[PDB]
């Protein structure tokens, strides 16, 4: 998903620190370590079975 820093509000990118992966901003020292699993599903529309024509 798209996450933002509560301090400034800029976009957060996923990087690797010294202990564990974390969300961090490119304009402030704010960071957020990942504790549990985080997922972002999209459920792409599957291709329906195109039936015969005629």
């Amino acid at each position: 998903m798209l996450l933002f820093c509560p301090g400034c509000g800029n976009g957060l990118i996923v990087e690797e620190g010294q202990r564990c992966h974390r969300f961090a901003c490119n304009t402030c020292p704010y960071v957020h370590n990942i504790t549990r699993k985080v997922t972002n599903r999209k459920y792409p529309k599957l291709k329906e079975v195109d039936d015969v024509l005629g």
């Binding site: 933002f4 509560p6 400034c8 509000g9």
Partner: protein
Amino acid sequence: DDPVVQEIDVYLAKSLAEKLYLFQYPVRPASMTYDDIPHLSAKIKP
């Protein structure tokens, strides 16, 4: 449709007419507040 209940009165105050400001944070949701964040000072102009 008649006023069966909730006949509330409206009063007017002029004590803080010139000292009342409305500060709103478009980037801070209402859940998290700055009550715990220690402030230092604020620069303003009349």
